[PDB]
Amino acid sequence: GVEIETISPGDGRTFPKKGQTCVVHYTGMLQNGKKFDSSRDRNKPFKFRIGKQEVIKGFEEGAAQMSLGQRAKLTCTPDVAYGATGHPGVIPPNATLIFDVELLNL
Amino acid sequence: ACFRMTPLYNLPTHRACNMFLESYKAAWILTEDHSFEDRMIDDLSKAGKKPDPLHQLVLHFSRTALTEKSKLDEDYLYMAYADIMAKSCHLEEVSFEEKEMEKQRLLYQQSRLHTRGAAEMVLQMISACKGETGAMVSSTLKLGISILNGGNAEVQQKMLDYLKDKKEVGFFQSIQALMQTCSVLDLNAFERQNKAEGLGMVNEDGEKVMADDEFTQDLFRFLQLLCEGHNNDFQNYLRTQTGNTTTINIIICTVDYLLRLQESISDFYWYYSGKDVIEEQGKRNFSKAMSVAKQVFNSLTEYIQGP
Amino acid sequence: LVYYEGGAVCTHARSLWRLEPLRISWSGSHLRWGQPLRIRHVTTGRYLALTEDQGLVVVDACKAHTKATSFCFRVPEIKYGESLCFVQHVASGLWLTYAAVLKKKAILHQEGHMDDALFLTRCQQEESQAARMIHSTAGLYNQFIKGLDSFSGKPRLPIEAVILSLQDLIGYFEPPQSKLRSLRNRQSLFQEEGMLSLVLNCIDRLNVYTTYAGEEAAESWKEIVNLLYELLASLIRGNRANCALFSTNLDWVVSKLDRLEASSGILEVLYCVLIESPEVLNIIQENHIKSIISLLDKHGRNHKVLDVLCSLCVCNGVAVRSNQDLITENLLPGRE
Amino acid sequence: MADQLTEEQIAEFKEAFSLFDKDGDGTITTKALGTVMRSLGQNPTEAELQDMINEVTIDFPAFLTMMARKMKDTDSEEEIREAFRVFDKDGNGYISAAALRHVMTNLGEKLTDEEVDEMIREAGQVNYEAFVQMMTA
Amino acid sequence: MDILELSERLDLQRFHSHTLRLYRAVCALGNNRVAHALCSHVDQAQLLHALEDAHLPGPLRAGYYDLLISIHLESACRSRRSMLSEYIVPLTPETRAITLFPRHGLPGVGVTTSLRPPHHFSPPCFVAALPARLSPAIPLEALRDKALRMLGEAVRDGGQHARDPVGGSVEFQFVPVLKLVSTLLVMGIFGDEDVKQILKMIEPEVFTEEGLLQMKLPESVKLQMCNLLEYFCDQELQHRVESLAAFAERYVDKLQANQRSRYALLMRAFTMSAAETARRTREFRSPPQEQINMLLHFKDDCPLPEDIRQDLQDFHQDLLAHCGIQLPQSLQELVSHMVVRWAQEDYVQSPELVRAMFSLLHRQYDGLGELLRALPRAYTISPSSVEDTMSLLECLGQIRSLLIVQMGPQEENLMIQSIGNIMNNKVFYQHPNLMRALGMHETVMEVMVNVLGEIRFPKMVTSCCRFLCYFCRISRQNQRSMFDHLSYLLENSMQGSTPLDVAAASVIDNNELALALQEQDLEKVVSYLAGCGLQSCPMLLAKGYPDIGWNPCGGERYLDFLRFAVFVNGESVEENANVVVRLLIRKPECFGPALRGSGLLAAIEEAIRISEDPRVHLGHAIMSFYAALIDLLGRCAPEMHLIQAGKGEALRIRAILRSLVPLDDLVGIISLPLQIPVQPKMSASFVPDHKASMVLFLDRVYGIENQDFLLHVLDVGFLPDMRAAASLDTEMALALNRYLCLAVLPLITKCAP
């Protein structure tokens, strides 16, 4: 499944599983902890769409699992996120796609 | 179909604007006259050890031509500068004083454009041409006839010194292969041109023959100017290349070209013998061939001038 | 075998021949018609002799008999041999001619041909000295390779002479503009005579042994290998033929560079030939980039390997997809 | 191909082809293309459509070239009609030698006197039938 | 480990610089995926921090600045530079009112009419569902503001002349910033205010409303400043082109109105006789180019208004004043003084810098000359088709980028899709002028040269050949341009379209190109015909059939090209026909195997035998080749007027071609019937086109003059063909009817007397 570990608890009643686009400060961590992708690094929060499945299935499931307004360590197995191959250069093969996506709005 | 042609006042606007702009550019820009060439050469020549900007440019072009790339680039800036300078020195009844003053001014303009090393760049570029006709050769020949105008002795002496020091056989073979491939009169080409003229220029909304007539005229003018001044040493060098490993006899090849020209003109006359009336295109071709032969014969005089 | 050929052969060192008069004393005197002389190849060192079985062909110096090697020119009368000089054997009297990229074999015939006259062109003394030095170096390398094969199969050689020859050759081919043109011409002449092939064979023989000879004798073997690699690097620079040969043997060069010992020299040779020949990158396979990536992990961080990778990324003014993808998928995902 | 074709006609044909074939590869069959052209106001003859199908999966420029080749006869007929109208513009529908010279000068071809005399002889003043024959050429 | 602390290490800094160089090389020349990977590695924030940090190491800061533009805006800047050549100025109400003078205007200000394709930037993402690629997004306005602030800080530091340069040297302090600002300037990042501020910083006193140029700079900084000056000159040229387009639109509208009024007056007027002819000379009877030239002949008697002539003269004088040919506040004077001072200051050892500086100087003084050179590369597009022209420019830039990158697998598909989009683009066939000016023919020729160099990518070659042939069919000027490059197509030139087909398409549909054919092309085609002998078709070799001593496919293609070259507009050029028949007969190997052995009837019988024996059948190809050969032999025959005039050369050629092939063989070939019906397949049998070619050969060579001969030829072959057509009166029936109407009917009409 998707490992969930809260870091910045917040509101739990609101849920982004309605099926609308949500703005989240999504960041990615490698198997060894390297920050291969971060919203702060891009200097702009990432807009994630719920239901459209534009993002990876594992990433979308992790984002939907976390309720709106709370931040948690949404660690995802590489098999469901990007597979064994992963990104051609960003993600090395057989590297876990650890995520720390934080829900900001929508 | 002329009566059915699309009128100008009933046409798409963009096509009308483009056609009018093209016509205006052709009729004005080409006819437009700019004398900035002398302006620029002198202003950049102000030079106000440390080489002059003209000296730096000449050295840069000499270094570029010295490379054994076996090819010539476009060199648009080289075309621009060659046109600037060649026209510069080309700035060229009257009493003796006026003629002497004009000669002194021409000598000063040459020396301003000669001491920097223009003769060396001419020799290097001609050697690197490898007998390949094109705009490069025409530009360098124009620049040479500009620098060598008036039969300057210093330019010829420095050219002889450069030839002796370099001792490179490339220049002779290059010039031989270059002037060997010069086009002559062709009866097939003339008949093709006549048929094309009979087709009609107005149909479907210069001449292939003697296309390089001006090119050969300028080349033989440069060769005559090289032989100008009764410079016996240069005549001996051109006759036999004793210093060079391989000697190319320019006399034999220019005589062969003269033979080719005489054959072409004789065949032209034989074709035109039947028709008493000479056509306008035929008259123009005859005049161009006559001018080419006149330049060739003047060059031959300058070869044979002196004892 | 004597054979007249045109093209680049006339500009090679294999076409250089020296005429030695019959009398050793006053060998520098002017040549006269009918004077016996001996022709010896500068590059090969074998004097030409009119052997009965082989006709007109090069013969060994030890077997170069005076009668067999006695040659004369038939019309201080001629200048540099430019005049018609029919080659005739003194003992036999046969006229040298041809029998059959034009290349006709040279043989001796009783009657010959009406066009047997040949013109001789004088060569610079520097070129003759370079040819003699190249022949001497080739002989020394052949002797060294013979000794290497001799002691290769026996567990327990002029090392100093080989090192001195390598140093002299490196000084000859030391990069400094006519100097670059002269160096390129010297490298081309050396490659035409087979110096590059001999150097490659010596390098392979050295790489065969991982350590044989005496303890003191084998101490300088690493220095000899380094000198040979430096000579190969010097020959590769400013030589299109050397670059093409290295591109053809790119797999062997990569395998040699994969070795820990003297990896820097092989890497420099590979970089130089890749710069000289852009086609090496196109013909390169994934093993080359894999070895380049592993070099930093194993040998350590080095700017030379990264510069080689930069050269591999873009060559001939264009970007090749294969090498770019290999470099982006080999070390970039790891980020180590 | 369609160098002499009108720009408006070319644009209309391009729009019709794009509407008929959304893929842009010209997969519309000859019969379907003819039906679309007929629905666009240019009704194609059945015999002409059959001949075009027999002569001919082809991109739009090929269809434009085929249409221009088919309509070249119409262009020739229009040119002949224009020449007939120009000839009729003269006195009594007949162009004299002076009228022919003026027409040649207006056309810009700069026809010589010998050419004008030959044209007059082929067509002293020509008649209406002679002018029509000269225009037809 | 801080990056700043590695400056004095002398090893970590060098390694980091080498890593930056490797990243730049990987991201160089497109490679958007590798650029995105490099951005992910740098996290798109480290580069900004390094740029904003003045204490970063010199080489490291230079590498980061280079990577900032090499991995983000390199593709955009390359596309902008490629599209800068095409000065397309579509009509627009805002662009209709444009003036060169607002004193001289500032370069690179105001609305530009150039239809450069917009730069497309994709936001970087590394969490999307991974299954070409667009360039990664850039801060744009924020990046432009940061670059402007850095340039201002560098200018202030240079003015202060502090002994602590940024990065440890002046080169590291100024060169990367200048390169970055130039890269974003060629991409159009800055607006009017930002470029005005940049110009003021470069030279505040020159552009009134010290400087960077006044302050001493190294060779690289001087080269960057010269590049900036070249961009300013290009912007001034673009402004001149925009003003010229606006004046062209206004003057074209005025001339349309005046021409309509003049035509109405001429139609109303009838008394004038000579004046009527004079008006008709410039009227619609003349071609539009001739009318435009006549209306513009008042330079320095034409039927034009005096007021409009004076207005045009004043506009031309204003243009001359703007170019400053003949009258450092002026921009051209400023750059001229700058290059003169740089040349006279000291010797510059960089050839590129001095070459670029000299280019700018001649560029600056000769404003009119550049305008003339850029005049052909200028056109006005329709306002309605602005989107179509933008798509054209984007596709052309895509093809140019593909050509820049090395050809390889999974990349020819993008070029083929681009070519399909160009073909489907409306402006490609509507207006050939953009096609010629954009260099699309040059780009397709370059990519064809690259792929051909064994055909590695046959689909790419076929698509390129189809595009080139379509381009020649577009207009006659395209055909002439292809003729100018025809030598490469004849020298280089299996299956599908071939470059020789492009050459044939260039030759056809025009007598001017057909007449001017050079003898080298005929010699090459004759050599190819000779080489066709003692060979086999590649299709036949693939099928495993034994070689027949020649290749019907390539030989037939070459022969069809020859017949296209000789036969244009129905007539045949005497010189071309004579030379082609002479070169054909000089080598007997180019003819059929029967001709030297055997006869035409024997060849037909053999072809029928192979047809009976078990769309790549050999018999049909052999019959088609023989029919093409006889048709080509009869096509170059002298016309009726040549025979009537009794020309010696024409009579000799006719006699030679008549004796080459006997008439009885032609009658025997025609006498062979056809299986008119189930209907058979004409792709593997004797097509009626062969009979049509035979009849045309007989008519153009022998001719049926005697009544007995006409009756005999009507009875033999003609009568069975007519009977078969009547019985079958179906693809076979249509082919028979076409053959009858194309060959039998004209010959019957001619032989009716």
Residue numbers in the entry:
A (entry chain E): 1 to 106
B (entry chain D): 3634 to 3681, 3693 to 3736, 3750 to 3862, 3871 to 3972
C (entry chain D): 244 to 318, 337 to 361, 371 to 426, 436 to 455, 465 to 499, 506 to 630
D (entry chain F): 1 to 56, 63 to 129, 135 to 148
E (entry chain D): 1648 to 1749, 1759 to 1787, 1796 to 1873, 1924 to 2014, 2020 to 2046, 2091 to 2216, 2222 to 2261, 2267 to 2369, ...
Quote the paper.
Ryanodine Receptors (RyR) are intracellular ion channels that control release of Ca2+ from the endoplasmic and sarcoplasmic reticulum. RyRs form massive (~2.2 MDa) channels that are embedded within the membranes of the endoplasmic or sarcoplasmic reticulum (SR), where they control the release of Ca2+. They form homotetrameric assemblies, with the bulk of the protein exposed in the cytosol. Calcins are a family of scorpion-derived peptides that can penetrate cell membranes and bind to Ryanodine Receptors (RyRs) with high affinity and specificity. Upon engaging the RyR, calcins cause long-lived subconductance states, which are readily detected in single-channel recordings as decreased current levels at 20 to 60% of the full conductance.
